[PDB]
Design an enzyme around this catalytic site. Sequence first.
Site, PDB file in Angstrom:
ATOM      1  N   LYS A  95      36.203 -15.645  20.093  1.00 20.87           N
ATOM      2  CA  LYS A  95      37.487 -15.630  20.817  1.00 20.87           C
ATOM      3  C   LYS A  95      38.575 -15.723  19.343  1.00 20.87           C
ATOM      4  O   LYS A  95      38.391 -16.363  18.550  1.00 20.87           O
ATOM      5  CB  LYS A  95      37.792 -16.685  21.760  1.00 20.87           C
TER       6      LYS A  95
HETATM    7  N1  LIG Z   1      40.823  -8.169  29.398  1.00 26.87           N
HETATM    8  C1  LIG Z   1      41.777  -9.395  29.632  1.00 26.87           C
HETATM    9  O1  LIG Z   1      42.851  -9.221  29.280  1.00 26.87           O
HETATM   10  C2  LIG Z   1      41.218 -10.504  30.230  1.00 26.87           C
HETATM   11  C3  LIG Z   1      39.822 -10.754  30.344  1.00 26.87           C
HETATM   12  C4  LIG Z   1      39.333 -12.052  30.968  1.00 26.87           C
HETATM   13  C5  LIG Z   1      40.217 -12.927  31.221  1.00 26.87           C
HETATM   14  N2  LIG Z   1      41.513 -13.073  30.906  1.00 26.87           N
HETATM   15  C6  LIG Z   1      42.446 -14.033  31.313  1.00 26.87           C
HETATM   16  O2  LIG Z   1      43.318 -13.275  32.314  1.00 26.87           O
HETATM   17  C7  LIG Z   1      44.604 -14.287  31.789  1.00 26.87           C
HETATM   18  C8  LIG Z   1      45.848 -13.281  31.746  1.00 26.87           C
HETATM   19  O3  LIG Z   1      45.248 -12.358  30.727  1.00 26.87           O
HETATM   20  P1  LIG Z   1      46.442 -11.077  30.874  1.00 26.87           P
HETATM   21  O4  LIG Z   1      45.493 -10.198  30.136  1.00 26.87           O
HETATM   22  O5  LIG Z   1      46.729 -10.906  31.958  1.00 26.87           O
HETATM   23  O6  LIG Z   1      47.538 -11.722  30.004  1.00 26.87           O
HETATM   24  P2  LIG Z   1      49.034 -10.948  29.854  1.00 26.87           P
HETATM   25  O7  LIG Z   1      49.611 -11.560  28.724  1.00 26.87           O
HETATM   26  O8  LIG Z   1      48.954  -9.540  30.350  1.00 26.87           O
HETATM   27  O9  LIG Z   1      50.171 -11.854  31.196  1.00 26.87           O
HETATM   28  C9  LIG Z   1      49.894 -13.028  31.119  1.00 26.87           C
HETATM   29  C10 LIG Z   1      50.354 -13.778  32.422  1.00 26.87           C
HETATM   30  O10 LIG Z   1      50.364 -15.142  32.374  1.00 26.87           O
HETATM   31  C11 LIG Z   1      51.733 -15.435  32.870  1.00 26.87           C
HETATM   32  N3  LIG Z   1      52.109 -16.890  32.418  1.00 26.87           N
HETATM   33  C12 LIG Z   1      52.288 -17.229  30.993  1.00 26.87           C
HETATM   34  N4  LIG Z   1      52.781 -18.431  31.003  1.00 26.87           N
HETATM   35  C13 LIG Z   1      52.685 -18.967  32.303  1.00 26.87           C
HETATM   36  C14 LIG Z   1      53.065 -20.141  32.862  1.00 26.87           C
HETATM   37  N5  LIG Z   1      53.401 -21.130  32.061  1.00 26.87           N
HETATM   38  N6  LIG Z   1      53.099 -20.386  34.294  1.00 26.87           N
HETATM   39  C15 LIG Z   1      52.712 -19.348  34.852  1.00 26.87           C
HETATM   40  N7  LIG Z   1      52.474 -17.928  34.656  1.00 26.87           N
HETATM   41  C16 LIG Z   1      52.386 -17.857  33.172  1.00 26.87           C
HETATM   42  C17 LIG Z   1      52.551 -14.505  32.359  1.00 26.87           C
HETATM   43  O11 LIG Z   1      54.019 -14.558  32.631  1.00 26.87           O
HETATM   44  C18 LIG Z   1      51.945 -13.013  32.483  1.00 26.87           C
HETATM   45  O12 LIG Z   1      52.204 -12.741  33.926  1.00 26.87           O
HETATM   46  C19 LIG Z   1      44.293 -15.221  30.761  1.00 26.87           C
HETATM   47  O13 LIG Z   1      43.939 -16.343  31.200  1.00 26.87           O
HETATM   48  C20 LIG Z   1      43.298 -14.514  30.095  1.00 26.87           C
HETATM   49  O14 LIG Z   1      42.431 -15.151  29.080  1.00 26.87           O
HETATM   50  C21 LIG Z   1      42.130 -11.639  30.367  1.00 26.87           C
HETATM   51  O1  LIG Z   2      36.538  -7.724  26.618  1.00 27.91           O
HETATM   52  C1  LIG Z   2      36.246  -8.246  25.679  1.00 27.91           C
HETATM   53  O2  LIG Z   2      35.249  -8.138  24.860  1.00 27.91           O
HETATM   54  C2  LIG Z   2      36.877 -10.004  25.674  1.00 27.91           C
HETATM   55  C3  LIG Z   2      37.649  -9.916  27.021  1.00 27.91           C
HETATM   56  C4  LIG Z   2      38.245 -11.367  26.882  1.00 27.91           C
HETATM   57  O3  LIG Z   2      38.659 -11.897  25.956  1.00 27.91           O
HETATM   58  C5  LIG Z   2      37.990 -12.323  28.029  1.00 27.91           C
HETATM   59  O4  LIG Z   2      36.828 -12.157  28.748  1.00 27.91           O
HETATM   60  O5  LIG Z   2      38.352 -13.360  28.465  1.00 27.91           O
END
Ligand SMILES: NC(=O)c1ccc[n+]([C@@H]2O[C@H](COP(=O)([O-])OP(=O)(O)OC[C@H]3O[C@@H](n4cnc5c(N)ncnc54)[C@H](O)[C@@H]3O)[C@@H](O)[C@H]2O)c1
Ligand SMILES: O=C(O)CCC(=O)C(=O)O
Lengths: 415, 416, 415, 416
Positions: B112
Amino acid sequence: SIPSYLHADDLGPWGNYLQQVDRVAPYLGSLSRWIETLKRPKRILIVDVPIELDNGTVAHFEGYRVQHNVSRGPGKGGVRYHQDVTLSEVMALSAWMSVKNAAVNVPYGGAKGGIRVDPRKLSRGELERVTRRYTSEIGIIIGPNTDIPAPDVNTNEQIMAWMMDTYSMNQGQTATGVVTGKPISLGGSLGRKEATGRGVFVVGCEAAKKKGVEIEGARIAVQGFGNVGGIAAKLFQEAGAKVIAVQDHTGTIHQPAGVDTAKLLDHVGRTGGVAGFEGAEPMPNDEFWTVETEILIPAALENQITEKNASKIRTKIIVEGANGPTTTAADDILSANGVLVIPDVIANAGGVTVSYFEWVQTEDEINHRLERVMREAFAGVWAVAEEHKVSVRTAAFIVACKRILMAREMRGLYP
Amino acid sequence: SIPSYLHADDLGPWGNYLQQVDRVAPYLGSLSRWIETLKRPKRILIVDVPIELDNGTVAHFEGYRVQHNVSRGPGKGGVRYHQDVTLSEVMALSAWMSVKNAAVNVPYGGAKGGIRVDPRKLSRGELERVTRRYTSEIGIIIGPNTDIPAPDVNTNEQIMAWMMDTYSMNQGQTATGVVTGKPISLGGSLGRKEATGRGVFVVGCEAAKKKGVEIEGARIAVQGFGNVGGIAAKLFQEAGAKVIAVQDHTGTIHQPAGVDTAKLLDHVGRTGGVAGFEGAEPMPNDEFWTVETEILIPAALENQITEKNASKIRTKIIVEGANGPTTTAADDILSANGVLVIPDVIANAGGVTVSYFEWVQWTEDEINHRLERVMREAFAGVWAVAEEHKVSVRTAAFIVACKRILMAREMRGLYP
Amino acid sequence: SIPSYLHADDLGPWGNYLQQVDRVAPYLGSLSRWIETLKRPKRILIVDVPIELDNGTVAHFEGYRVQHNVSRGPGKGGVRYHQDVTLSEVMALSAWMSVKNAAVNVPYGGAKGGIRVDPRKLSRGELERVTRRYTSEIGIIIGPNTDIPAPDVNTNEQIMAWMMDTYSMNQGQTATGVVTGKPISLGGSLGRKEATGRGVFVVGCEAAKKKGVEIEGARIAVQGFGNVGGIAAKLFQEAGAKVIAVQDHTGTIHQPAGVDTAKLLDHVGRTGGVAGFEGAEPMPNDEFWTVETEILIPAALENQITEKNASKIRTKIIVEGANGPTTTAADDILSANGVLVIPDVIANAGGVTVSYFEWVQTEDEINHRLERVMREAFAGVWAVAEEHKVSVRTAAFIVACKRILMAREMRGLYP
Amino acid sequence: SIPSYLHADDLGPWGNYLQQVDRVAPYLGSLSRWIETLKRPKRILIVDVPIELDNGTVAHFEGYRVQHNVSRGPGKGGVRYHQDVTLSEVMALSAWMSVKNAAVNVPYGGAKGGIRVDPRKLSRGELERVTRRYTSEIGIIIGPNTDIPAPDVNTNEQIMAWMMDTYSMNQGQTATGVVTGKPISLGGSLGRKEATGRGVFVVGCEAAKKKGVEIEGARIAVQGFGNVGGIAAKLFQEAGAKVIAVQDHTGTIHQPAGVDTAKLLDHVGRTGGVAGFEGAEPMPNDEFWTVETEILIPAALENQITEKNASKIRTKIIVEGANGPTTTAADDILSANGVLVIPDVIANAGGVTVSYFEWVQWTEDEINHRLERVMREAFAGVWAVAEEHKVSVRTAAFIVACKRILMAREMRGLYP
Ligand SMILES: NC(=O)c1ccc[n+]([C@@H]2O[C@H](COP(=O)([O-])OP(=O)(O)OC[C@H]3O[C@@H](n4cnc5c(N)ncnc54)[C@H](O)[C@@H]3O)[C@@H](O)[C@H]2O)c1
Ligand SMILES: O=C(O)CCC(=O)C(=O)O
Ligand SMILES: NC(=O)c1ccc[n+]([C@@H]2O[C@H](COP(=O)([O-])OP(=O)(O)OC[C@H]3O[C@@H](n4cnc5c(N)ncnc54)[C@H](O)[C@@H]3O)[C@@H](O)[C@H]2O)c1
Ligand SMILES: NC(=O)c1ccc[n+]([C@@H]2O[C@H](COP(=O)([O-])OP(=O)(O)OC[C@H]3O[C@@H](n4cnc5c(N)ncnc54)[C@H](O)[C@@H]3O)[C@@H](O)[C@H]2O)c1
Ligand SMILES: NC(=O)c1ccc[n+]([C@@H]2O[C@H](COP(=O)([O-])OP(=O)(O)OC[C@H]3O[C@@H](n4cnc5c(N)ncnc54)[C@H](O)[C@@H]3O)[C@@H](O)[C@H]2O)c1
Ligand SMILES: O=C(O)CCC(=O)C(=O)O
Ligand SMILES: O=C(O)CCC(=O)C(=O)O
Ligand SMILES: O=C(O)CCC(=O)C(=O)O
């Protein structure tokens, strides 16, 4: 502002280094715009160092390699094995490398390594396995042309041989230039072994000339009696000084007539410390710092001369063999008390100076060049101290940091 | 013990991860002798990220790349830009990558990245420069066959495009496989962009079947409305669900008739958040957790469902889109209250799954059809293990994942 | 503004390519900002290729590798050996590679190689030595993951085998992915060998449906009877068309009944060209362009259909096998005369498409997926042409250049 | 035969170089069979150098790195920023590097770089971006053991610092040896900066002895007053000579008493050129060449002494600081007029000589003292050759250099 990965009330040695940076800040002219570069290491590498113990269980040790600044050249600096090795400590040590390297003007940036382990608790096999695994893990950023390790506390020619061998096997070819402080069978010399101690002796003699102190019959106290302290003591006795007090991790001894450094060296080598030495009397550890001397040589670990004991020190010259033995609050007290303090980043640079020689490459030829290099750097820093009416430490930082940030200035930022 | 470079009174998410590791410990058998490997990342790289700001002054940002475990293959994992990015947080996130990658069985280790910065405070040029300098600083340990970054919070196809270009220019050749989440023009797809949200939707449906919840008419709440939360909410409404409450960093909105996710997505796009949305009413942020639902989807940041608010939750299923949103203390409360919790390390793995499909190279529908099928299979496998050991789905996911990770460690051995 | 290393009065095919870019500019929208990227090759490498001749003297040949654009992926494109190879020509050919690769949507940037030599004037030994020296010299910018050469005029599986071997020997390991167009024994296929001609045939049939031209009984004229021209004529005869006129570097032949393409292939293989073919009548070169046909296939060199002869052409469809056979002045004349022109950057993309298939790695399955890719690429471009009311060529550039420049836009400039 | 990528009617400086090669052809002996090697650069790299301008527009510049001959060692040679940089010019410059390196016997092949840009027309930021993008684009063929750039027209220690930093960030490690002409803070010296001008002075004094010309009271005219011209004029004034005429791109000044070169250097530093210098009188540009001198030093650009102005020159010695300032037709005219011409490939090798010293690891005075010695000895060797064959010093210099380059080519042979 301090990095989020550190704790402000737990900055350790790095907190002292930052104070030393604040003190040079008013003297940097237009290079001031770049001062935060000194407070941010380019590269911190923290590696897991797992080995199988002799008793059959897996043990995990923290390994570090910090490259603080490489504006001027490849990283250079030693590797510490010690139970109190921490991120903040390896950061500070790598910073003082950057500064000492610039101050004596060797073409190296500053770097440092550490394993958080007490080698006394490991068998010889376990020590070897830890050393090799660590070298494998940090291999990705070290190399003869990239970052070159060396000894420090609890490491030595054997540890360096194991490092050089491991990196060579990993890479597929003998690479003698990947570490300095090597055994002579692999490229090293008795020159490098005594370089740090000899530098300390040389700059201590130059300071004595300034302070009007006669070396013949001069009283010397030394903290630490290992590679740095033991050699510095040997040379001062050979110059006709009396080494009257020595403290190490095992305790303190005291000899008004001056210890036999030759016998004490053999005793230290035979038992691991000065405690029990026949040619001296045991002394309470605290009383060490109050023994009246001409020269005091801290050559153990950091943070030994502090706000707490600085006022009770009765000496004319302090010559810092150790990295960061004296805090800035202590500097102030010692100056107010008329003590001349010769800073680590000048005084202990003999080692990296010959490390440079080993990296590029009689024994007298080496030593006579080292003595020249050390006197010249001292002479130069003294002139800066006089010019700006500052301490030798501040002056050392003026000279070193002007060279570091000018390199940063010229190199610029990309993008 | 914990590493000396962390403080016990300040472990962040790493502390929660260590608790999750403690809970899988009874199930490891002969692999227990290797359990500490799970609590030690192989490699922590912290880099200085200096740039000149638009205003003439030099700014220094903290950059991180943590490779937690690569026993099973190259590192894989996102890059987070956020003002609260810290060492312990990037550590925890990289560890959840190791686990989620082993859980769904993609041949990637866990890694990460993070930059401690609020992108809202940076110009577009500044954000570019930060991205490029970061990429060149961590270049030494990433690469298409070594460690492959991807999007996370506040990063996206543009950030990924900048990282890919920077690395290529540093290396002297176009290297499209160095990151995933790329824009279509550089090798990516609308498939990958909606993958994580779709994975959340698929897994939430499988869970709903197990609890006897029908999706049509089902009430959904969602924290976060970004890449993960927005797509999840969109798919649930399209399946007949009512998204009645959304909270993000700008506020909470409530609408018992179910919001128009199409219009809300647009609104968040124009304004930056759900605050001020026409088709809803504003609601106190604390009150968000008390809204009765069928499914609650934390898809924002970590440590959001805690001992403070877990007893107040009234829902049948939690499906974790976010990384680390629920503490182990909250797990115990939710379980006592009969709430089904589907862990992040299964529910949000749709991204890294399709990331694998991007890296390795069939219509988008076919690609989705394989994703949907992969998620269903992993869910059923973890569920089978939960039943076998009478544990939670979180513990079962760790059983499956850590057995794969530590058997890899066991076979590889220690050198020397 | 053209680069200073070219001459405006001597632009060769690069001049034609530049006019094509000018014709797509009005359709790029926000990507217009980047249009100069199309006009500037990322990398031009000119290498000395010295060998010792059989007669004992040293000969120096000009070698070229141009990487025009690598935004979307690694460079891909053939190597031409021809006496009239020039910087401007290799540039143009590399640029058409970039465009065709984006039009058909393979994940490759555009690149091209050339050696200014007439192979007819070299012994086999000399041709080999030239091939090997050339490969060693451009080695520094090619490779399986960087830039992948291929055949073109006067090169073939034997030249590719020598290139692949030389690169393998220089690097120390067998690297079969460094070139495509390899012999079967080294990883290649009959599918790749016939790929370009098959693509020309496929696309030609799709255009025929659009224009209501029945392939059965259609009169075909082909310029060039090498790898592209020979294979296309063969497939058209198998489909029931009459190949009534063939021109190559040795002359022109005419056979209203349609030549036995199989026998003509054998004749060319034995004598060097179509001249003297028994199953046809010789005919003046110039008269070739006036023979009334349903489909005309330029599959020789560039700048063959020009302002000087375009008005004379009596055909319903032009399918470009060669790179750049038709100038923009000719396009306009042809347009006014109701001739459908299917551009090189779609029609001849069968090679690179199966080269892609080779680089990643049945025959019927391989061809079935070649044919599907070509039809879908053609329909897509056709849709764009109708959508914007532009020629098929312009539409192909619209599709290709929007993809190229969007990759540029997204990647940005560093710094 | 000339290569097809050049025009015979537009050969620029390359054409003059070829005339020079023809003049050495009768003296090559058995090495004649290899003469075409001199006429074909091993490697020509032309790169696109795109940047975003400050005004928001994308600008494309032409970048060049030509490695002419590397038979004897790694490539070595400067980088020129100038609006008239062209392929033929960089080729000619690379070839003169091959020759001079062989003439003074340093273990380097000849190479040269350029960007077709007028630095006056770019901001400092735009100039930096151009430098860095150029360095990243030619990175594939440069390196401390491969091809080491240096300063030339309009480049300097700041440009070198940027190249060095860019290459280091691209490669992932500090590489101070990738360029020479670095600032002191990065490993360079004052010896290197003054090195070329000093070597011009040294050989100028060596020729003055041969011609019985007294330095004290000698009239000097210099064209160009930058790094080479400026330092050369300073060193002559300090040796008691009078610098009575200077021409640069801004105009010409005259001062029969001899200018204060210290004050002139300061004026040039402040305003960009010699125009407006209070301590002299303005003078028409064409009249520069007709001023009677003991020593004339062309230290500007190529093709300044030609058929057009050669018969007009009234001097005893010409010492070429610039690369290719004098044509072969002018050479013949000057020889008939009894003017002694010391060629560029000997006179300006002082730079590469100390560049070698920088690349390899003594005080500044010992560095200079060694420079002085190697320059005197190289001059004396070429002089002995010229007298041996009854040819000019230019022809003799080529005999020495070309015998060494072609013997290296002879031994290495052709593979295959
Ligand atoms: N492919 C990916 O993008 C991916 C994969 C696996 C897991 N995740 C997890 O999903 C979650 C969001 O990822 P994303 O890709 O949606 O991020 P993103 O930046 O598109 O949007 C993030 C969201 O979190 C909200 N947020 C931020 N601070 C906040 C708070 N204090 N209270 C409430 N809401 C709040 C923001 O307003 C926004 O809606 C993260 O935990 C990330 O690790 C993302
Ligand atoms: O797509 C990836 O390789 C990483 C995605 C990621 O950061 C997550 O699963 O939280
Ligand atoms: N080339 C070098 O070895 C080199 C160069 C420059 C600076 N230094 C610094 O010099 C110092 C000593 O280095 P070394 O190479 O001599 O180490 P070493 O391991 O040879 O000996 C270390 C000394 O420190 C003493 N020590 C340890 N803990 C102590 C405690 N709590 N109280 C008192 N004494 C204690 C030990 O007893 C021993 O005398 C360190 O600060 C090191 O960073 C070493
Ligand atoms: N994979 C490929 O080979 C491929 C792919 C795409 C495009 N192309 C283009 O197709 C064309 C031919 O390629 P090839 O691979 O068939 O070459 P090839 O060398 O097999 O045969 C080339 C043909 O051109 C003819 N020719 C040469 N000079 C001529 C002249 N002055 N007048 C008439 N005919 C002349 C020769 O007689 C021969 O028939 C070239 O433009 C090449 O760039 C080839
Ligand atoms: N180490 C070196 O810098 C080095 C070494 C060897 C040879 N050289 C050659 O010396 C010459 C200049 O070297 P520099 O390093 O002094 O460049 P510089 O850029 O410091 O100054 C160049 C000089 O040329 C003058 N000039 C430019 N165009 C002119 C014109 N049209 N008419 C008259 N004067 C003009 C400028 O005014 C300036 O005085 C070039 O030929 C360069 O190749 C330089
Ligand atoms: O020899 C070296 O590289 C330096 C050793 C070191 O770490 C020090 O100077 O403290
Ligand atoms: O197969 C390839 O890589 C390209 C062949 C070629 O040169 C062309 O398409 O014109
Ligand atoms: O320092 C060098 O490498 C040589 C500089 C140069 O290009 C020249 O000699 O003209």
